Design a protein around this ligand. Sequence first.
Ligand SMILES: NCCc1c[nH]c2ccc(O)cc12
Ligand SMILES: NCCc1c[nH]c2ccc(O)cc12
Lengths: 212, 212
Amino acid sequence: QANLMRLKSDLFNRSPMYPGPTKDDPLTVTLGFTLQDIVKVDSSTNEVDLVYWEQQRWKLNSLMWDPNEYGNITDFRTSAADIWTPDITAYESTRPVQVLSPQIAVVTHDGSVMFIPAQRLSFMCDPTGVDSEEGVTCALTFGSWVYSGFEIDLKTDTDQVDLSSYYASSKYEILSATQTRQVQHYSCCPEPYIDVNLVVKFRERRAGNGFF
Amino acid sequence: QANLMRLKSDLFNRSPMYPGPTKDDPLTVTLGFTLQDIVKVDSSTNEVDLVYWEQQRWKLNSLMWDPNEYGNITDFRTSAADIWTPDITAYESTRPVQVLSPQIAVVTHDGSVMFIPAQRLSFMCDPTGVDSEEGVTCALTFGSWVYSGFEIDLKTDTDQVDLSSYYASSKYEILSATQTRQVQHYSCCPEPYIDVNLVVKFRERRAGNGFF
Ligand SMILES: NCCc1c[nH]c2ccc(O)cc12
Ligand SMILES: NCCc1c[nH]c2ccc(O)cc12
C-alpha cells in the first residue's frame, strides 16, 4: 500500500521523536491485564512466575493525521520501536521480564496507541498455603519507573483482571484477580508516583482436566 | 517383699485366667488419649504418624482382694502379660503399632486396672493443606477388634484429648483434638461395635522455636 508507506514516512522521518511527558504536558496511560497462566511457584525463594498480556493505551498529538490525506487510512500496525512507549515497570520482579510476543503497536489517526505485549515475569510472592482450599494471595505493582504522577497518570478501564484466556489446565486456579490504581512514594523522591496494584488470589487446581 | 509376693501368687498361680467378657458378663473399658507428637506426614501415601499414650481402664471381679489379708496392700504394679487386657485396636492403621514404653499395669484391690502404653502409629490420613492456616483434619477410630457392644462397651472420661504433654517444638501444632464414643457396624457382622473416634485438627507449626 502506497498510502501507508507515505503515512509512515511522514510520521517517522521528518521530526524528532516525542521526548516523553512533562509537567506541562502530562500523559495518562490506561492499563489492563489479561492473566494467562500462573506457571510456577518456588517455595524455597518465594518467587512466583506469571504469564500475562499487558494492555497499554495512550495518545500523542504528534501521532495524529488526517485520513483524507492518506487514502482514508484510520489506523496502522507498526513496530513499537518506531514510537515512544511508556516505561511501565513491575516493581517486585526478581528476574528480567521475558517477552513472548511481537512488539508491534496499533496507532490510530487521532494519535491513540494500543500496545499489548505478552510477558513472563518472576516476582516476589510467598506461595505457602497454595495447596489448600483458602489458597494464597500475592500482589504486584506496575507503574512508571522514572515519571511521577505529574508526568504520567495511570488508569484502568475495569478493576477486574481479564481471565477469559486463563489456561484451564494450569497447575493453579484463580480465585480472584483485581487491578487497582494506587498512589506510592519511594525513598529517593518526595513526589507522588502512580501505580496499578495487581492482586491475585490462587490455589493448586484440583478440579478439571487431569481430574476425575 | 513378702505380702506382695503372697498376693501375686494367690491372684495368678491358682486359677484359669479370665476368658474375656461375654454377653452374660460384659465389660466397659474407659479410654483416654495423651497426644504427644505428630511426628511425620507422608503426602505420597496419605499416612501420618502419631505418638500418644493410650490410657485404658477396666475392672475384673477376679482381680479383687481384701487388703487386710495382704498387709494393707491396696494396689500393685505388674507386667501386663500377667493379666487379661482388652483388644483395643486402631482401625485405620497402616503399619503394626510400635510400643515405646514398658507394658506394666497398676491393679487396685477392687479389681480395677490402669494400663497406659506409649505407642507410635502410622494411620490413614490425607495431609494435603497441612501447611496452611486452616490445616487439616484426620480421624482414627479405636475399639475392640473382635468383641461387639454386647461384650465390650467403651467410654471416655472426657471428650478432650490430653495435650498437656504435647511436644512444643513438633513440626506440627494441634488446633484441636477430641475423643468421642461412637457406634459402628462392619460388613462381617450384624452386631454394633463400639469405638472411640480420635479426631485431630493440625497444621505445620509456623511459630515458636526455629521461627523468626
Ligand atoms: N494477540 C492478542 C492481542 C492483540 C490483538 N491485537 C493487537 C494489536 C497490537 C498488540 O500489541 C496486541 C494485540
Ligand atoms: N508414665 C506415664 C503413664 C503412667 C503413669 N503411671 C502409670 C502406671 C501404669 C502404666 O501402664 C502407665 C503409667
